[PDB]
């Protein structure tokens, strides 16, 4: 049964942070640790969707 | 001067001998994979060698 790579339509604004920095703080809430223009880090939470690669 | 030296002589334990080895510990972020650690242990080996 042949695997079908089934292509769909080109997520047009895709915030692809690498997995190396995204951690879960608190339970179930992913927090990228984005530093602003201040050179002060800010732990803004995200919602971590489909891990691609 | 005995107890004046003895209270400032710190009651420690056995000295760190130069035992010919020393253990280097790495500690990556929480949930960092084994590819990254070897890559850091590429550097630390390249640091302790070169």
From Swiss-Prot, chain A:
Location of the protein in the cell: Cell inner membrane
Reported phenotype of the disruption mutant: Cannot grow on efflux substrates novobiocin or fusidic acid.
Function: AcrA-AcrB-AcrZ-TolC is a drug efflux protein complex with broad substrate specificity that uses the proton motive force to export substrates. This subunit may act as an adapter protein that links AcrB and TolC stably together. It is elongated in shape, being long enough to span the periplasm.
Entry similarity comment: Belongs to the membrane fusion protein (MFP) (TC 8.A.1) family.
Subunit structure: Monomeric in solution. Homotrimeric; interacts independently with AcrB and TolC as well as AcrZ. Part of the AcrA-AcrB-TolC efflux pump. Complex assembly is independent of an efflux substrate and appears to be constitutive.
The protein's name in its UniProt record: Multidrug efflux pump subunit AcrA
Organism whose genome encodes this protein: Escherichia coli (strain K12)
Swiss-Prot record, chain B:
Localization per record: Cell inner membrane
Disruption phenotype: Loss of susceptibility to contact-dependent growth inhibition (CDI); inhibiting cells still contact the target.
Induction: Positively regulated by MarA, Rob and SoxS transcriptional regulators (at protein level).
Quaternary structure, from the entry: Homotrimer, with large domains that extend into the periplasm, interacts with AcrA and TolC. AcrA may be required to stably link this protein and TolC. Interacts with AcrZ. Part of the AcrA-AcrB-AcrZ-TolC efflux pump.
Family: Belongs to the resistance-nodulation-cell division (RND) (TC 2.A.6) family.
Function: AcrA-AcrB-AcrZ-TolC is a drug efflux protein complex with broad substrate specificity that uses the proton motive force to export substrates. (Microbial infection) Involved in contact-dependent growth inhibition (CDI), acts downstream of BamA, the receptor for CDI. Its role in CDI is independent of the AcrA-AcrB-TolC efflux pump complex.
Protein known as: Multidrug efflux pump subunit AcrB
Organism: Escherichia coli (strain K12)
Lineage of the organism: Bacteria, Pseudomonadati, Pseudomonadota, Gammaproteobacteria, Enterobacterales
Gene: acrB
First-to-last residue of the parent protein present: 551 to 600 of 1049
């Amino acid at each position: 049964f042949v695997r079908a790579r089934l292509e769909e339509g080109l997520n047009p604004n895709a915030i692809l942070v690498p997995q190396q920095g995204v951690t879960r703080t608190p339970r179930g809430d992913a927090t990228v640790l984005v530093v602003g223009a201040d050179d002060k880090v800010e732990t803004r939470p995200i919602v971590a969707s489909q891990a691609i690669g | 001067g005995m107890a004046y030296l003895f209270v400032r002589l710190p009651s420690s334990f056995l000295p760190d001998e130069d035992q010919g080895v020393f253990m280097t510990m790495v500690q990556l972020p929480a949930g960092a994979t084994q590819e990254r650690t070897q890559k850091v242990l590429n550097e630390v080996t390249h640091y302790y060698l070169t």
